[PDB]
Amino acid sequence: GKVQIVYKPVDLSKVTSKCGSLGNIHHKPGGGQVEVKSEKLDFKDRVQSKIGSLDNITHVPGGGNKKIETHKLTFRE
Amino acid sequence: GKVQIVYKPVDLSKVTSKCGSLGNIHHKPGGGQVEVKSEKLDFKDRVQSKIGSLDNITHVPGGGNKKIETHKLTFRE
Amino acid sequence: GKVQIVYKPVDLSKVTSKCGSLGNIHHKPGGGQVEVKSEKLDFKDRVQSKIGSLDNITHVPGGGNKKIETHKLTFRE
């Protein structure tokens, strides 16, 4: 006999923003100091690392809106 | 008998922004200092690394909007 | 008997921005200082690394919008 499986979700969603103006932004942090002392670094299978990092970031996207959706039909997993 | 499997999701999403003007942005951090010391670095299988990094970033996209969507029909994994 | 597997997702999405004007942006960080000292480096199988980097980046795309989509119909993995 018939097996009928229908996966048909409808998506009419909206993610939105309306901004009149995005101002005066001043990213002026005082000068940072980073000091890392080590004797030996020994890395093997799939290790990932950041050592002694000083990052200054000003992002300010004006939208910066995001949508994430995952649709899945699965029989064994 | 029939096996009928139909994967037909319908997507009419919007991800949007309206920004009237994108400002006056001043990324002026004080000068950072990074010091890193080692005797030995020893890296093997599939290591990835960053050592002693000083990064200044001003992004400011005007949109910067994003959609991430995944669609899986799968029988075994 | 009939096995009928149909994969027909419909995408009518939009990822959009409207920005009236993209300002005056001043990326003027103070002069950075990076100092990395090591005696010996030893890298093997599939290693990737960055040592002693000073990066100043001003991006300002005016759109910078992105859509990532992935579609799978799959039977073993």
Residue numbers in the entry:
A (entry chain A), B (entry chain B), C (entry chain C): 273 to 274, 306 to 380
Paper excerpt:
Although the resulting filament structures differed from those of the brain seeds, some degrees of structural templating were observed.
